[PDB]
């Protein structure tokens, strides 16, 4: 839905490779398009985005299934140990990506709810942004009535 | 306005889901005023 | 690395066995695991940790300061500042 | 001048006293700020009337920002 | 240069009264444009209320 | 510099323009309160007592011709921010 | 601009080779301004107050030396112009007094007039504007 | 001071947030009514480059102008809602 | 007598007359002008229509000494029945500044002339309270709170002040202020919220203080005050309840609508801009056209 894909053909491949949680696909493309990445100053970010293959791999699976065992996620993303799962997810939730909590006495990960925020004080923050910007537009227009009038008066006859 | 529990055989029944009767009107409000701005922008900017 | 995993594991767990915290934050004694727990102000009572206890005290620290009160922005303040732009 | 302005209930005599206050305060500038606050605070029509012209005469013949805003 | 002042040496930082001239004259010319346009703005509105 | 010492006196003059600019806001407030006051008087007249006529025809669009139940016939001025579209058909009207 | 000029005089140490070189003399110019703010209020209280510790020792020494630099351009509007602004008697009395030399009859009168018309138009301060007026006539008479 | 008076109910009505049934109704009614005249605001300005102020009002039926009425409605419900959220928030925080 | 008396409305003619009388009898320095209050009574709404001075003295050494003229009241009542039919003696005013206990004794004698219970209407001549200066009272009898001593004491009747539409027009336009009896724009309604809260603040302080002085000084107990103030605590809201949660849904609803109203006014001022921008192109073309057209005119003159 971008109106060209005619140089965005490497970064379409990057969305896909992170998306499935597949490591091999990430290796094949990064070597292939190495000169292009180097030129665009996007090669440094792809050392971190190697790291986020698995971190975003988790993000589809924990979203899809509210409660899913530690062992089931070892299936899906082919992870070493149950303990290996817990470590990856714990980092991500401090960074805020998952929004979840791991329960070790019942051996499953429970993806936390967002609830209704309509009954919380969150919509009042969004409005505050909107209100402040709109007040600023009404004051600005009045100043800019005056400005064309000065420009024209100075200008040589028509 | 119900949903059916097969997890133990219950039928949860609620009346209409409560909604902002006000916010219905406010979608219509935005739809009206928005075309006014397309005209304002067209006419003020085809001067120069 | 040991200080970094304590941060992650506040949000993840509510409590843990003392043998589990031991495995996770990597330690070769239980003297190290509890020393590390009481640095992060988590009672080691019942032979379980209690991560939530440090979370309470960070929130109080913030409420005493005047940097947290206007970030919230109260509803008396929002309306009055809203009113004076119009009448200006 | 001030005391007998407040004192006389005859309206002609108050007005003459209120204007005659002004004249003494020609060229005072800064030391006429005591007078000016008293004349304007009063709820008498004549006192305020001459009260303006205390401000005219103090800074008369050169500009002044404080005097222009007050008036 | 890169170790000595050796560019924009004909004004600014030459005697202290030199940068005093420059700072202020640029401020005054910006200010008079602002004060006239605001006073005109604000009078158009007070005429509307009067109206 | 000559311009600069002449400036000092000019800057004072611009300051009185500054004080004009503060003065507008004080005039504005007075007028806005008062527009609502002016309007309050006219609401007194809109409301009771009234005497019922029957509206005939517009002769302008700000002045009309009516008849009354008083036994007379008048020319009356039509007050603003009221409908001028519903005086076309002859219908009962109220006159102050 | 303000953190810099306050820090310079707060220190009570070197920033005063920048007058003699080219670096930042915007710091110097804000120091001239700062002098107006303190002097005004203290000129009502006394006609001698320039050697108090309320007024900084750097502030005083800079103020006099700036005038010294002014007269070496050999345009006397800077010397005198600053002098009036500072709420300073000493700078004025000396400035006028040294530069009368019978360059011309017409011209010696002019030196005083620049400052004199400046006093009347610019300064609205009653105490100060009165003093100046007496001084001006003493050099004219002389 | 005597003639004017200071009311003891001036302080009670300040610190009372009116019933909430009347408030759901207030917002609901007002926002809905501005849809009917919002639409007519477009039709007014389809052209505006035409001469004469009365003329504009005669072509598209802009009599008792939809710009002036619609704005007026926007300012007056806005004044009340800001004061109402103000009073409500004052009472809850104040009293306990 | 009367068992119908809830409120006393007072016209501002009465409040001003009392004020005048104090200053035209030359009675000052906490001495008393007392006069009769005239108007209809024996109604839930008591309305005082008029007032006139009575001859009155007091000696503050012994307050069991005062002078009230017995001739004067009869003569004034006869005259006053002629002017309006409204007017009859419905109490007596006191000029304040406070309610002295000396005011019972006067009220006791005053009952004889009256056709009702007389009212003790305090009108303060120096202005007081965030509320009115004017506070009304009626003599009633009741048992104390120590369960001992039936004392005739004074029952506060609240007041709001009213005038007929006859008087009111002259009040509204003579006034030459903002008024606390009318209001303008939003700006004045911000003022009102600050003033209304300030009254609470001051009033709370009086309640705490009263509680102090009971347990310190040891003024006698009142279960009228303590009993009413018991209710206040159960009426009290608290936090953390489902009710406060319902306030927050309403606060989002009302600020959201205030956001859409604001957006609307952005398009309104965006209109005014346009009209001016159109006005600017038309004015600039015709302004210049004139100059050109004038050069040709001048040119005809020059040629011959």
mmCIF file of N, CA and C in Angstrom, chain A residues 131 135 138-139, chain C residues 79-88, chain E residues 45, chain F residues 28 32, chain H residues 74-80 82-83, chain I residues 186-187 190 258 261-262 265:
data_model
loop_
_atom_site.group_PDB
_atom_site.id
_atom_site.type_symbol
_atom_site.label_atom_id
_atom_site.label_comp_id
_atom_site.label_asym_id
_atom_site.label_seq_id
_atom_site.Cartn_x
_atom_site.Cartn_y
_atom_site.Cartn_z
ATOM 1 N N UNK A 131 -6.652 19.163 22.588
ATOM 2 C CA UNK A 131 -7.224 20.368 23.172
ATOM 3 C C UNK A 131 -6.223 21.481 23.086
ATOM 4 N N UNK A 135 -6.369 24.900 20.489
ATOM 5 C CA UNK A 135 -6.307 26.232 21.082
ATOM 6 C C UNK A 135 -5.218 26.954 20.401
ATOM 7 N N UNK A 138 -6.447 28.456 16.735
ATOM 8 C CA UNK A 138 -7.334 29.635 16.792
ATOM 9 C C UNK A 138 -6.500 30.906 16.985
ATOM 10 N N UNK A 139 -5.483 30.977 17.897
ATOM 11 C CA UNK A 139 -4.563 32.152 18.161
ATOM 12 C C UNK A 139 -3.635 32.503 16.894
ATOM 13 N N UNK C 79 -9.453 21.948 33.771
ATOM 14 C CA UNK C 79 -10.542 22.814 33.446
ATOM 15 C C UNK C 79 -10.237 24.279 33.547
ATOM 16 N N UNK C 80 -9.383 24.657 34.560
ATOM 17 C CA UNK C 80 -9.210 26.107 34.815
ATOM 18 C C UNK C 80 -8.305 26.660 33.806
ATOM 19 N N UNK C 81 -7.155 25.907 33.493
ATOM 20 C CA UNK C 81 -6.246 26.248 32.391
ATOM 21 C C UNK C 81 -6.934 26.251 31.002
ATOM 22 N N UNK C 82 -7.972 25.387 30.772
ATOM 23 C CA UNK C 82 -8.854 25.298 29.649
ATOM 24 C C UNK C 82 -9.736 26.527 29.519
ATOM 25 N N UNK C 83 -10.347 26.958 30.623
ATOM 26 C CA UNK C 83 -11.174 28.129 30.706
ATOM 27 C C UNK C 83 -10.377 29.442 30.325
ATOM 28 N N UNK C 84 -9.153 29.780 30.876
ATOM 29 C CA UNK C 84 -8.406 31.001 30.648
ATOM 30 C C UNK C 84 -7.820 31.189 29.241
ATOM 31 N N UNK C 85 -7.715 30.093 28.423
ATOM 32 C CA UNK C 85 -7.223 30.246 27.060
ATOM 33 C C UNK C 85 -8.310 30.871 26.336
ATOM 34 N N UNK C 86 -9.624 30.474 26.536
ATOM 35 C CA UNK C 86 -10.751 30.940 25.815
ATOM 36 C C UNK C 86 -10.977 32.436 26.167
ATOM 37 N N UNK C 87 -10.881 32.760 27.443
ATOM 38 C CA UNK C 87 -11.267 34.101 27.834
ATOM 39 C C UNK C 87 -10.194 35.137 27.608
ATOM 40 N N UNK C 88 -8.980 34.654 27.425
ATOM 41 C CA UNK C 88 -7.790 35.464 27.053
ATOM 42 C C UNK C 88 -8.044 36.351 25.884
ATOM 43 N N UNK E 45 -10.798 42.597 16.598
ATOM 44 C CA UNK E 45 -11.670 41.912 17.561
ATOM 45 C C UNK E 45 -12.490 42.875 18.475
ATOM 46 N N UNK F 28 -11.838 44.619 26.053
ATOM 47 C CA UNK F 28 -12.496 43.418 25.420
ATOM 48 C C UNK F 28 -13.429 42.752 26.351
ATOM 49 N N UNK F 32 -17.698 42.302 26.395
ATOM 50 C CA UNK F 32 -18.258 40.941 26.337
ATOM 51 C C UNK F 32 -19.320 40.665 27.432
ATOM 52 N N UNK H 74 -21.772 26.340 20.026
ATOM 53 C CA UNK H 74 -20.496 25.807 20.434
ATOM 54 C C UNK H 74 -19.883 26.495 21.578
ATOM 55 N N UNK H 75 -19.954 27.837 21.702
ATOM 56 C CA UNK H 75 -19.432 28.575 22.826
ATOM 57 C C UNK H 75 -20.200 28.394 24.189
ATOM 58 N N UNK H 76 -21.542 28.325 24.088
ATOM 59 C CA UNK H 76 -22.443 28.289 25.240
ATOM 60 C C UNK H 76 -22.583 26.930 25.946
ATOM 61 N N UNK H 77 -22.582 25.806 25.290
ATOM 62 C CA UNK H 77 -22.573 24.467 25.901
ATOM 63 C C UNK H 77 -21.195 24.265 26.404
ATOM 64 N N UNK H 78 -20.142 24.862 25.690
ATOM 65 C CA UNK H 78 -18.718 24.696 26.083
ATOM 66 C C UNK H 78 -18.451 25.341 27.397
ATOM 67 N N UNK H 79 -18.968 26.573 27.635
ATOM 68 C CA UNK H 79 -18.886 27.332 28.899
ATOM 69 C C UNK H 79 -19.430 26.518 30.030
ATOM 70 N N UNK H 80 -20.624 25.896 29.859
ATOM 71 C CA UNK H 80 -21.240 25.099 30.925
ATOM 72 C C UNK H 80 -20.526 23.827 31.284
ATOM 73 N N UNK H 82 -17.170 22.928 31.005
ATOM 74 C CA UNK H 82 -15.918 23.237 31.633
ATOM 75 C C UNK H 82 -16.191 23.525 33.127
ATOM 76 N N UNK H 83 -17.348 24.268 33.390
ATOM 77 C CA UNK H 83 -17.743 24.699 34.761
ATOM 78 C C UNK H 83 -18.296 23.517 35.523
ATOM 79 N N UNK I 186 -17.837 33.453 31.469
ATOM 80 C CA UNK I 186 -17.110 32.305 32.049
ATOM 81 C C UNK I 186 -16.160 32.806 33.106
ATOM 82 N N UNK I 187 -15.556 33.978 32.777
ATOM 83 C CA UNK I 187 -14.593 34.640 33.598
ATOM 84 C C UNK I 187 -15.147 34.940 34.954
ATOM 85 N N UNK I 190 -15.484 31.587 37.093
ATOM 86 C CA UNK I 190 -14.239 31.087 37.691
ATOM 87 C C UNK I 190 -14.081 31.733 39.093
ATOM 88 N N UNK I 258 -16.372 18.527 25.075
ATOM 89 C CA UNK I 258 -15.624 19.789 25.091
ATOM 90 C C UNK I 258 -14.455 19.826 24.126
ATOM 91 N N UNK I 261 -16.274 20.382 20.609
ATOM 92 C CA UNK I 261 -16.811 21.686 20.524
ATOM 93 C C UNK I 261 -15.632 22.654 20.076
ATOM 94 N N UNK I 262 -14.410 22.321 20.642
ATOM 95 C CA UNK I 262 -13.189 23.091 20.395
ATOM 96 C C UNK I 262 -12.692 22.997 19.016
ATOM 97 N N UNK I 265 -14.814 25.132 16.613
ATOM 98 C CA UNK I 265 -14.506 26.553 16.725
ATOM 99 C C UNK I 265 -13.205 26.782 15.941
#
